[PDB]
């Protein structure tokens, strides 16, 4: 029932880090009704209007010499500083995945099954999950739901394998992750 | 490898709502509860390693409020165009019978940042143990939000997340059941 | 260890 027009202002200060703190880039962005109007980019070193409505601000801010000089120092006094503050529990956050494997269909030997490897609860996102049949890798018939972000500093993903289980086959889901010395492995016996 | 830390703020009229948050690689580090003037860590452990003086966010938001008024006047009171959300319902971990989990309602790609979220179990609204995040940033300057409902799974319970937003023509109803 | 904000600046009036 509320029909009133809305008016929105957003501000983003973005610190982009490469090879640790070796290379840093600072982007300040002013955004009105979802459209960016002015930005400061540390690789340019001054404010630039992104739309015409932002030109008065770029001109006003760039006319203040000492202000621009502080904004340029902020790659050190803001970006590198905050990076250092959080490194212990963000860059270095390591959380082991819970990994299980199970057949999607209960069925006799010699029939066509989907074996499932759920890998959940891990951080960071970088992870490699491979399927093995009797000690041999299999890159055919592996299909994965891709990497999903739970918004709670964890990730999950499902990796499926289409196979025909045969009498002596032992199947292994292998997963490599920064949190773990050597790959994790979980088996399913036919 | 590359990383990105974002300080993201917003102020919205006429609702008079404002938020202040830091984001690391798409996850929230903290936001500031402006009413209590307290830093809210997304995980408890963060507050044991770092601090943030919450009061400072109020100064930024005061200036945001002033800028919004200036830009509103500058645009000749031109309002924001509503962008309606899309809504996914999922779980943080695989669902197993009689094993407590949490239902996630993920609301994505919407603006302005005002949304009404309802949890429905067997068709009736339920709020026991619910929590939610603040409005999270996106590179296109739209918003994301996560709502959570802890629950124990059964074959007898059916669930819906109902999302209301001004860019929709009718509430979005997203469904989930054990399968 | 203390996070620091960057200040929002006032637009041209």
């Amino acid at each position: 029932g509320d029909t009133r027009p809305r008016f929105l202002w957003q501000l983003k200060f973005e610190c982009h880090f490469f090879n640790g703190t070796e290379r840093v880039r600072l982007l300040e962005r002013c955004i009105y009704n979802q459209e960016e109007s002015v930005r400061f980019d540390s690789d340019v070193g001054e404010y630039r209007a992104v739309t015409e409505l932002g030109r008065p601000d770029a001109e006003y801010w760039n006319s203040q010499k000492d202000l621009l000089e502080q904004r340029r120092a902020a790659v050190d006094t803001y970006c590198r500083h905050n990076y250092g503050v959080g490194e212990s529990f963000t860059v270095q956050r390591r959380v082991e995945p819970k990994v299980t494997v199970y057949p999607s269909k209960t069925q006799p030997l010699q029939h066509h099954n989907l074996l499932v490897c759920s890998v959940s609860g891990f951080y960071p996102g970088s992870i490699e999950v491979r399927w093995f049949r009797n000690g041999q890798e299999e890159k055919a018939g592996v299909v994965s739901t891709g990497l999903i972000q739970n918004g709670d500093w964890t990730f999950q993903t499902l990796v499926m394998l289409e196979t025909v289980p045969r009498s002596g086959e032992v199947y292994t889901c292998q997963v490599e992750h920064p949190s773990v010395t050597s790959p994790l492995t979980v088996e399913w016996r036919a | 490898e590359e990383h990105v830390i974002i300080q993201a703020e917003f102020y919205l009229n006429p609702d008079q709502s404002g938020e202040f948050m830091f984001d690391f690689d798409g996850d929230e580090i903290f936001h500031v509860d402006m009413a209590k003037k307290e830093t809210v860590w997304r995980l408890e452990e963060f507050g044991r390693f770092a601090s943030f003086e919450a009061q400072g966010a109020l100064a930024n938001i005061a200036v945001d409020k002033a800028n919004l008024e200036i830009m509103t006047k500058r645009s000749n009171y031109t309002p924001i165009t509503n962008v309606p959300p899309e809504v996914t319902v999922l779980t943080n971990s695989p669902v197993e019978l009689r094993e407590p989990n949490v239902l996630i309602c993920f609301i994505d790609k919407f603006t302005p940042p005002v949304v009404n979220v309802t949890w429905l179990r067997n068709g009736k609204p339920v709020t026991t143990g619910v929590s939610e995040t603040v409005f999270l940033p996106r590179e296109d300057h739209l918003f994301r939000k996560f709502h959570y409902l802890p629950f124990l799974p059964s074959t007898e319970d059916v669930y819906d997340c109902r999302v209301e937003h001004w860019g929709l023509d009718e509430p979005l109803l997203k469904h989930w059941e054990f399968d | 260890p203390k996070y620091v904000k960057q200040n929002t600046l006032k637009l041209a009036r």
Partner: T-cell receptor
Amino acid sequence: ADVTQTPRNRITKTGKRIMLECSQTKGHDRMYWYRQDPGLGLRLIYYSFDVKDINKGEISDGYSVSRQAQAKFSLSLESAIPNQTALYFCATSDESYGYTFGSGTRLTVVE
Amino acid sequence: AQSVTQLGSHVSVSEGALVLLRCNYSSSVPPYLFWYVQYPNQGLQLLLKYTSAATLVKGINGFEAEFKKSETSFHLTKPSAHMSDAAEYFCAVSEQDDKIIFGKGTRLHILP
């Protein structure tokens, strides 16, 4: 003359509530009340980052403030005592640590 | 912020000689640093402001100050003391928290 304080000079007896007023013309969100005493520098009493926003400083005991409007910041001695004799300075700050101090209020509290 | 320490509540300098007023600071974050002057029967005037833009900060009247992180110092200097430099001088710090915390002040006395 962006920052104006009144009164400039005040005597008061102890035990009384006393109000000092600060007004600004620059529209700054940040305002501050400090007091200055020989050998202690300026100490921050209270500060405000927005309308109705109130934060205690180093020495807020025996003081209160109100910030009903952006242009004005009021300091009250709740129940004046002699050691609140001092020079009181209000200040504003812009968004990049540019402070403007008022001219000062010389307040003497006598028994 | 956290703290600033000025040395000496009253100090002297001969007319014409170098002025040096000492300030050391304590801060967990890269600070804003300031020097203010209060001339007799007046208010507070900013002399100079460190913003991390540069270690050598220049102010009005020949005042300067060098930010030295390794000794956490920010000492104020002026090449030649004039009688009109008689005043009280305050160093100050902010731990990027939108509040200035002042040192105790040093009163400079000029010997004619």
